Amino acid sequence: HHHATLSQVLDFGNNPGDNEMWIYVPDQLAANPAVIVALHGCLGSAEGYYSEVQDLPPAADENGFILVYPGSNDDFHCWDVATAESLTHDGGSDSRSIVNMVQYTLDKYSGDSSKVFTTGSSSGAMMSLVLAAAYPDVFSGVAAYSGVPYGCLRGSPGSSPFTADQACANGEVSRTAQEWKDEVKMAWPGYNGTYPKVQVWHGTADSVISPNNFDEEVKQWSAVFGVNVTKEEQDSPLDGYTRSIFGDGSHFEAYLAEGVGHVVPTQVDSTLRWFGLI
C-alpha cells in the first residue's frame, strides 16, 4: 500500500532565510487540516527531527493534520533568534521563511488558518517562542522543549551555543517579568493583541541550556498573559515531571522534569492536547 513520507518542498514561495522546507502530508487529510511546524535543534535537520520525534507522523496519520519540518543549513544548523529581521513581525530571515512555508501549506491544502501550531527542541524551541511573539497572528499554540526566553539572544552575532557571548545558555541572564514582556512587545511594536497558548518544558540537569532559562520563560509568559501558578501536578505526564498550571490553564503551562537533561523528549499527547487537536 502507498505510505506517506517526508518530502522536501523545493519551492514554497519567498524564502528570505534561505531555509529548507520538508513536509509530511498524510494520505488522508481532515477536510480543513491543521498545520504543525516542527523545528529541529542546532546541528540537526528536518529529516533528523522527523526521526527524533517518532510519534508525531503517526499522530498526523490518525488526525489528518499536516507536519511542516523547516530546516536550517546556516549557523551550525541553528535557527536565527538573534537578528532584528528574524525577531520581528515581517522582518525576514528564518522566521519569515517559516511563515511563508505555513502560508504555502494553508493555500495548497485549504488548511485551517486558526489551527497553525509550532513545536521545537533546543534551538527549535527558541524559534517557537520567536514565532509566538512575532507572529501571533499566524500561530495559535506553541510547545517549546528546552529553550530560552524570547529575545534573550537579541543582538548576538549568532544563535548557536558556540558563540562568545553565551550568557543566555549559561543561565546568567535574569530580567524582570516586565522586561521580558516588553521584549515580547518589541517583536511587533504597537501590537496589542492575543498571543498563542504557550507550553514550555525543561530538564533540571540540562548542561547545554541552563534550567535558569525555564524560570525566565515562566516570568516572560506569566507577564504576557497576566497569570500566576494556580495548580501544580506532580509526575505529570511522567515521573518527575512537575506541571505548573497558570490561571485557568488556557494560556500558559510549564513542565520541569527532574533529572532530565538536554533535551526534554517531546510528549506528543501533552502537546497535541495543548493544541486542541486531540
Ligand SMILES: *[C@@H]1O[C@H](CO)[C@@H](O)[C@H](O)[C@H]1NC(C)=O
Ligand atoms: C496599546 O497598549 C498600550 C498600553 O500597553 C497603549 O498605551 C496604546 O495606546 C495601545 N495602542 C492602541 C493603538 O490603542
